[PDB]
Amino acid sequence: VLSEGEWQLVLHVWAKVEADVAGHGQDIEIRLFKSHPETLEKHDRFKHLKTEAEMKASEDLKKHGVTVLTALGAILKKKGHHEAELKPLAQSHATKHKIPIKYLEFISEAIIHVLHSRHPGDFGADAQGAMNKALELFRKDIAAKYKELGYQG
Ligand code: HEM
Numbered sequence: 001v002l003s004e005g006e007w008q009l010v011l012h013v014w015a016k017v018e019a020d021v022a023g024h025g026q027d028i029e030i031r032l033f034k035s036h037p038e039t040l041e042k043h044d045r046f047k048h049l050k051t052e053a054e055m056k057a058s059e060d061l062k063k064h065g066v067t068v069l070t071a072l073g074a075i076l077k078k079k080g081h082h083e084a085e086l087k088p089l090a091q092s093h094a095t096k097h098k099i100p101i102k103y104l105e106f107i108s109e110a111i112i113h114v115l116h117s118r119h120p121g122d123f124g125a126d127a128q129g130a131m132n133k134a135l136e137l138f139r140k141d142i143a144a145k146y147k148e149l150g151y152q153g
Contacts, residue, residue, distance in 0.1 A: 001080070002079070002080065002130065002133050002134060002137070006129075006130040006133060006134075007076075007079045007080075007130075007134070009126060009127050009130040009131075010076055010127075010130050010131055010134045011076060011077065012122075012127075013115060013119065013122065013123060013127050013131060014072075014073055014076055014077075016118075016119055016122070017069055017073070017115070018069070018070075018073055021066050021069050021070060022062060022065075022066055024065070024069055024114060024118065025062055025064070025065025025066040025067075025068060025069050026055075026056060026061065026062050026065050027065075027114045027117070027118070028065055028068065028069070028107065028110045028111050028114050029055070029061050029062075029064060029065040029068075029110075030052065030055050030056070030061075031110040031113055031114060032106055032107050032110040033049075033055070035106065035109070035110065036103070036106045039103050039106055039107075042097060042098065042099060042103070043060070043061075043064065045060040046058050046060040046061050049061060068107065071085070071089065072111075072138070075138060076134055076138075080137060082138070082141070083141075086138075086141055086142055086145060087145070089142065090142050090145035090146060090149065091149070093142075094145070094146045094149045094151035095149060095151065098151075100153070101139060101142070101143050101146060101153055104138075104139050104142065105139065108135045108136075108139065111131075111135065112128060112131060112132065112135075115127075115128075115131065116128065
């Protein structure tokens with residue numbers, strides 16, 4: 001459980017993410033793939049990318065980065081009450097794309113890193129703690145859906 005203050009901290013930083021969703025999305029994907037290159041293999045449309053030049057030029061890479069942040073945005077704005085949002089996400093990512101909870105932990109790390117990198121003036125220990133809690137809640141709830149779908153996990 002996050003307090004109302006923690007949720008507002010999250011949403012306040014998220015407003016900044018949504019002020020440049022394209023740049024943030026590119027940054028999180030590039031960071032994810034550089035830190036954990038095996039995750040790129042899951043993306044058949046752009047698993048060919050190797051160089052950062054290629055990554056920055058990829059429309060497909062940017063599109064997933066933007067969709068991640070936009071989806072997460074809608075989820076976070078529900079402040080925990082995100083069952084309806086998580087349902088389709090767990091469905092596709094468990095049964096179609098086959099994305100392990102481990103990879104959602106990786107992309108969560110990438111998000112935290114990029115927030116810290118782009119917003120060092122606002123994103124201190126308090127905001128990072130709150131963002132970590134919100135992402136942890138998301139991961140726990142999606143993991144429970146993964147199990148329900150038989151996807152381990
Ligand atoms: C906060 C975490 C994430 C969110 C909110 C998210 C959201 C989405 C959405 C909305 C789509 C399009 C509709 C759909 O298929 O469900 C999609 C597609 C897809 N996703 Fe994610 N995703 C997340 C994490 C990741 C990760 C970590 C992987 C791979 C490591 C990935 C792999 C894919 C693939 C392969 C597709 C299909 C087409 C494409 O490449 O865009 N997802 N995701």
